[PDB]
Symmetry: C5
Subunit: 259 residues, 5 copies
C-alpha cells in the first residue's frame, strides 16, 4: 500500500480513551485481579497449570468512526497503570516481613507490556517447558516439541480474544507486527520491587522512521496490555499473581492510502 | 474556554511558596509524621484498618491575588522533600540490624507524589481488596464490588480535604485532570532503600504541548503531595509508615481567557 | 580497500531477518535451551566441565544476493530476545521461594551479547582457571598457561562453528573485529534479576564514525549471539543455565569499493 | 542589580580545596569515623553523644580583595579516597565463616554546596524528643511539629563540627545565593557507588546566567559525605566519611547598589 | 606552553593499542589474576596485610613515534577483556545453596582507567592509618590520623607496576592537568558485576578548550584498575579477582610554543 497525505482540519482527528482490565485468572468471586495460588509440579512431565492460575494477555478491539481510501493513523499514546497505590495495602491477610512486622507487599517477577496496532497483535509461542499441559479454555502453542522451548515457527497466533492467551506461552512476534508498536519489560527475580511511575505529562510517539503510525484496517484500533505487578504472599506463604488495569489515550488522524 | 495572550509587566507575575506536611496518621501526640504500627487482618473480609494507620493525600488550596477575564497560569515548579537527613537517626528505639548493630533505617515501600492544578486533583478509586472496611473520618470508594479491585468507574472523587483521602484507595484519574499536572512513583518491596535527591537548581515546566499551564479557577492554586518514605521498625519489630513534608515553589503569570 | 559511494535506487537495498537459537548444552531430548545441572570441582586442578554443562556462542552465516566491485554494507539492526514471558513459568519443577510459595524464577548471572559483521566474529580466549579441562567437541584456548587467566595473545579464534565455542572461554577480540560491530553485557551475581526489554521501535545504527558499516566479504553476513538469561533452580536446588533465542533484522545497502 | 562581566586575564580566579568530613572522631585514632552507634530504649530516652553524630562540613575561603563581586561559575567536585573502602582486612566482621571483612555500606548522604554566603538551614527531626548533646547546634524549642515542619528552626551553616547532619537540611525557602545538591540513600545494605573523574563540570549559573555572588570576597563551600557504616568484628557499627574536593572557577562581575 | 595548530596530512596521526594486565597479588604460580585469600586483623593497630593480598594500580608507558611538536591524545576506546570468564561457576566455588552452582565473583569492585601525557599523579588516603603496609609496596609514608581523611604530604606518581596498592591511593584532583581519569567504586559485599563490552563506544579526551593530553618525551601513559569483585572458594575464603583492560588511543601532532 502507498501511504499518501494526512488530512487536515477539525474533523480530521479523533481520540480513543479507555482502560484494559488485567486478566490474572480470577480464582473466585472475591479475587478479581489475582491469580489462583501457585502450585508447583513434581516434574516437567507433570506440569499441568489450571486456567485460573495463568495470567493472560488483555486486548480490546475499538471501533473507529467509519471512513468508507482513508485510514485512521495512530500517532500518539498516553498510558499508565491504574491504581498503583493499592499496593500499599500491607494490612490485608499478608505474610509478615518478620515477627510483629507489616505484611509483605506485592513483589517478585513482573511483566509490563502495551501495544497499539491497526490489526491484532501477532504472537509467537515460546514455552519454558514443552511438556506443560495447558488447560481447556486457553489458546496455547499446539503440536509442541522440544524445539518449542527455544523457537518453533509453527506457533503463530493473533491476540484476538480476551482471557485466552496465557502470558507465559506467547510473545509479540518480531518477524511480523509491521502495523503495530509494542513495548514490554520482564523483570524477573523473586524479590524484585515494583517501580511504577504515573504522570499525565508523558506521551509516546507511534510514528516509525518514515513518519507513519499504525493504520487501522476496517476502522478498528487494537490495544493490548499485560501488567503483572508481581506476587501477593498471603499469611500461609502461598503466592498469587496480582495485576492492575492500564489506561490508554490514543490520538489518531486521517491518512489517505492507495491500493 | 478560549486561551488568549499572556499579560506582561511587573505586576503580571506572582510566586507561591509553601510546605505541605505529610498526613501519615499521627497515632499520638508525640508521633506526628508517623502512622500507627501496622497490623495484619486474618482474612481479606476482616480487613479493617484504623484511621491512624492509613496515610492520606496532602492538599493545600492557596488563594492567589484577586483578578475579578484574567486567570493565573501556573508555569514552573520547584519541589523537594524537606528533612531527608532525619532518616539518618538510627539510634532511636530502632530494631538493630544484627547483634550490637545500629538501628535499621526507614525503608520498604514508598510513594512519592506531587501535583499542581487550577482546581482540585481528580481521583479514581482502586482497591487492593474490595472488602476492606475503611474507617470513619476517611473518604473512600463507596459501593465497592469485586470489580473495584481492577476498575470501577463509579469511584470518582476530588482531593478536596486534608487528612481524609487514604493513599491506598485513590490514584489520580487519568481520564480527567486536564487542568492539573501530576507526577508519582510507587517503589514497592519490603527492603527498598529510600533514594532522595535535593537541589535548588531543578525546575519542572507545567506548560502542556500547546504552551498552556494549569489555569487557576476562582484564583485558587491547588497543591497535592504524598511522601511516604518507607517504614520505621522499632525494637519490637513493629512497623510504622514515616512521611516527610514537601516544598513547592510555583511561578504564575496572568493569562486572558474568553 | 577504498570505500566509495553508496548505490541508490529501489534495488540497491536488501534485508536479512532470522533468529539464532541458544546453545546452552541440551543435556537430554527434553531440555533444549537448558544446560546440564551445574556441579562444582573440589579444586581448580580437577575442574573438568561436561560439554552439556557449557553454554556456547551462537553463529549464523547468511548468504546475501550475489553482487560481482560492490559490497553489501550493513547499516541498521533491530534485535530482541524471543520468549521473555516463558520465564513466568514458575510452576514447573522449581524450588519454592519459601514454604508454600511459588517456584523460584530464572535468575543469577546473565550474558546477553550480539554482533553483526561482514566476516566471522574474532575471538580472544580468557580463562577463569587455566587448569580447567575443556571437553571433547568444544573448541577452547590451547596451550593454556597461568597467563591465560589474564591475557595470553596465543588464544585467537574465529567464531566459525555452532555448539563449539564455550561462552566462558572466549570474548570478542578488541584488537581485531574492524569489520564487525559487537555489543555485550555480563551481569554477574547469584540473585541478579533478568531485566528483558522488548519493542519493535528500537534501531541500532551500525555505521562507524566515518559512516561505514560492516562490509560483507564474499556476500556473507555474520550474526552472532549469546543470551544466557540466568539459572533455573529445580526442586532439589540444582541449577541449570537457561537461554533464549535472539531475533535479528539487518538492513543492508550496496556500496562501491576499490582494490 | 547585576551588570556586565569583567574581562581580561586578572578578571578570573580559581579556588581549589579539600573539605574534611566531621563524623564525630571518637578517639585520637579514629578521625573520619563516628563512635559506635548505640540505640535508645524509647523515643523519650534518645540522647546521642556528640562523637556519634556526623555534622555538616563548611569552609569559608577568602578571595582576592576587590562595586565588583566574584561570581562562582563552574564547579568540579569528587569524594577523595574512594579506594580506602577496599580495606576489607582491618578488624571487620566477616561476611561469613572464613570470609573477608564486610565493607562500608548502608545509609549514605552525599551533599555539596557552593555559595556567596553561608548555607541556610531548616531543621527537621526524626524524633522531637531527642536530646542533642552539648557542643552541637540543634533545633531549639522542638515540638512534635518539628518532626514534619516547624519554621522556627532556621540556622546558618557558620561553624564546623557543630551542625548535626540528621537535624538539618538546606532551607529551600532561602539559599538564593547558593547552589546545593544532595542525595540520601537509606537502607542498611545499600552499596556505596562513588564515581571519580577530572572531566566533569557543574555549571553554577541560574536561569538568568548569574552564579553565586561572593559577599565580602568570601566563597562558602559545604559538604557531607557519609559513605555508610563500618562494622567491626563485634558487630558494632560506626559511620565512615570521606573528604570532598572542590574546584571553583570565578569571574569578576559589576553590581549596582 | 602555548598550544597552537594541529598538523594535518597522512603521517600527522598515530594509534596506540594494548592491554594492561591486572595486578591483584598473584599468591602462587597458578593464581595470576587473583589475590591471596583475605585475612582480617584483630584490631586496627594490628592490621598488616601481606603484599600478595593487595591489588595494585596497573600502568604502562608507551613510546610514540619520535618527534616543538607533541603527540596529542584525542580519543579512547576501552573495555575489560574476558568478562565471560566470570561464568565459571563450577571451579572450587562455594555453593549458593544446597546443591546449587558456585557463587560468582561479586562484592566490591573498582574499575578505573586514565590516559595522560605523563604519569598519573596520586593522593594518599588510608582507611586505617595504623595499617602496616608490606615491603615491596609503595605507600603513604609518615602516616598520621589525618591520613584517614586528608594528609597533603601523601603525594606520588604512578610510575611503577605491581607497586601502588589500590586501597592507599586515588588520582590527585589538585593535579593531573595533563591526564583524563575515570573511576567507579561500587562497594557492598554482594554487589553484582555489571560489565559492558562493545567496539562502538568512544571517549573524547579533549578538554573544554579542545586540547587533549600532550605526550611529554613522546610517551603515552595508560593506567588501570579492574578489581571485579571477590571469588569465594569452597571453604568460604575470599580472594580479589581482576581482569585485563584494552586501550585504543588515537593521537595527532600538535604544535606547541616554548
Amino acid at each position: 500500500v502507498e501511504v499518501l497525505e494526512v488530512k487536515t482540519g477539525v474533523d480530521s482527528i479523533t481520540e480513543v480513551e479507555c482502560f484494559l482490565t488485567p486478566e490474572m485468572g480470577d480464582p473466585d468471586e472475591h479475587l478479581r485481579g489475582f491469580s489462583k495460588s501457585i502450585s508447583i509440579s513434581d516434574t516437567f512431565e507433570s506440569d499441568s497449570p489450571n486456567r485460573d492460575m495463568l495470567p493472560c494477555y488483555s486486548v480490546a478491539r475499538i471501533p473507529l468512526p467509519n471512513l468508507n481510501i482513508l485510514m485512521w493513523e495512530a500517532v500518539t499514546l498516553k498510558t499508565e497503570v491504574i491504581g498503583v497505590t493499592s499496593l500499599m495495602n500491607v494490612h490485608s491477610n499478608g505474610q509478615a516481613t518478620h515477627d510483629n512486622g507489616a505484611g509483605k507487599p506485592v513483589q517478585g517477577t513482573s511483566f509490563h507490556f502495551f501495544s497499539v496496532g491497526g490489526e491484532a497483535l501477532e504472537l509467537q509461542g515460546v514455552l519454558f517447558n514443552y511438556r506443560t499441559k495447558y488447560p481447556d479454555g486457553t489458546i496455547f502453542p499446539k503440536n509442541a516439541t522440544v524445539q518449542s522451548q527455544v523457537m518453533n515457527t509453527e506457533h503463530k497466533a493473533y491476540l484476538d480474544k480476551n482471557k485466552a492467551y496465557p502470558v507465559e506461552c506467547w510473545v509479540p512476534d518480531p518477524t511480523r507486527n509491521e502495523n503495530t508498536r509494542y513495548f514490554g519489560t520482564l523483570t524477573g527475580g523473586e524479590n524484585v520491587p515494583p517501580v511504577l511511575h504515573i504522570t499525565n505529562t508523558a506521551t509516546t510517539v507511534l510514528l516509525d522512521e518514515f513518519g507513519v503510525g499504525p493504520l487501522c484496517k476496517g476502522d478498528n484500533l487494537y490495544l493490548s496490555a499485560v501488567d503483572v505487578c508481581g506476587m501477593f504472599t498471603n499469611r500461609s506463604g502461598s503466592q498469587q499473581w496480582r495485576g492492575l488495569s492500564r489506561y490508554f489515550k490514543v490520538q489518531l488522524r486521517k491518512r489517505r492510502v492507495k491500493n
